[PDB]
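Predict the assembly for these two chains.
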Amino acid sequence: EDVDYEKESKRRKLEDEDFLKLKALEFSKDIVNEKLQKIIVVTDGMKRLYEYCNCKNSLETLPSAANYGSLLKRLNLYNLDHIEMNVNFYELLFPLTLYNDNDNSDKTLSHQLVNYIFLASNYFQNCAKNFNYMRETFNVFGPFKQIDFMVMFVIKFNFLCDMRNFAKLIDELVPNKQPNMRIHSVLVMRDKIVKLAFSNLQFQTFRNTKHLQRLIMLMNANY
Amino acid sequence: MECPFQIQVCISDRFFAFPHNLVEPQSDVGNKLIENLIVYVPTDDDRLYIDKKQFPKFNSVLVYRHEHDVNIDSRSPKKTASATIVYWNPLVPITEIGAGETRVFSVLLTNNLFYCNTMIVHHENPKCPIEFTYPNLRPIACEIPLSHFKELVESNDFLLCFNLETSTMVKILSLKRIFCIFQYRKQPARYVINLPHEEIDNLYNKLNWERTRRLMKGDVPSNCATVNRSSLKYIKQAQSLLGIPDYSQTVVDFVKMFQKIIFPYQLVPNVIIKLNNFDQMVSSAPNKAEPYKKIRLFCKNDSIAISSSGIVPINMPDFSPPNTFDYSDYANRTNINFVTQRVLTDGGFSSGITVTPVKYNYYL
């Protein structure tokens, strides 16, 4: 017999060495980000919606969209109020921060990421700046009960096409298990001012969904 | 205060990382398992490391920064068994509890946690780390743990900082975490800190209280700790007056060097005497002017001990009130004076001479 615990104490002593190795394995990069996987899945993951998005250059309004706006009139059948009027912004863009630029990179990418972030920020700032103008320029095609939601969708979709392109530039570079602290915080504060812009909007609002429902969920940060 | 009934504390330095494994779904009597779970953390930053996927046992998991309310403040917190609750390294008392016994897993015993059901699962880390100060360096952010993960594996020369607003509690917490991970590290890396540090010596005193608190239930580790300024400068002067082969030489070096010789002379080194002398508190203690803390020093198999004041017999109050007293027929003022006159005459010395007869404790 050996009733004393010291046997198990020694066993713990042994185990302890592993601790650091285990933790390091628990902090190494991760192979892929399922959020980006979901993006790639949904991108043209529903009937032919890619082909309408001829819009480009990330800084454009009513780029001959009226052709697509006709099909948005047809979409007007749906209760487009299911669309969120707010932009999830950070709550979608978080996965992009899971990249230590010191590795799997020339350390150059984060710069372009911040540039794209400020781009989209100014985009949405102009959207808030001119929404009513945009309302009228598309109301040209006829008022609709949910024209506000239609405009919101137009904005979000046109953004999303560029977002798809931008993501496919990175093309599933290996992410870290955790985001960059400073990039995350910068995103956080810029999202603060962005939601402040939504507050400054001060507007008020004016099933066979499953396909378009996929993109609606994705806009609404379904997970 | 005290911990409310039906709450338990588990200390583990390992809890510096979130122990995703251990927790199990609580259930009420009647096996009413509560897969709804909510967790509370010092900061939103803490959430960024913590993964929902680790807990298939639960269908519903949520996490929030703690905030110290007012209206619920009670010795007995509010109860809500409808959800399991966890607090991880909490700073401040909690006013609400989950299903069944609530449990907290934390590195650090706050005073709030004293009168509490507590377990530690402790283990000794043998490797004491060190500070160093030169006035190459690794700039370590003063708060974020894993920002420099594996850098703390690779290097040994760690610079530290803080932002002005920082809660002292947060400072202590981060420092504790760093020291634990260092004690796990295989070599004594060197601290460097860019702060006025007087408040850091204050916080060190806090750490002393904390370690004692632990030791109330603890592993009695031989944990290294030091006075950091008075001592520091003194030892620096000591080295300077000696030859300085290494201005970076650790104190423990000199300590052990004297250890080599103490027993053969059976008497107390002045270095160790000045230690436990010029600490504010753990010493002769200018905090309260307490030289009364004389050291009784013992060694294996001895029939006797070495006091601050000479040999003593074992387990007795340092000096007998009775003795072969210093009978005044010696130490007669008159005799002392005469001798002094003789001496001064011979020396041709005008000033600066004083003498005192010796005195004796238990033994002569």
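The first helix of chain A runs from residue 6 to 27. Chain A has nine helices and no strands.
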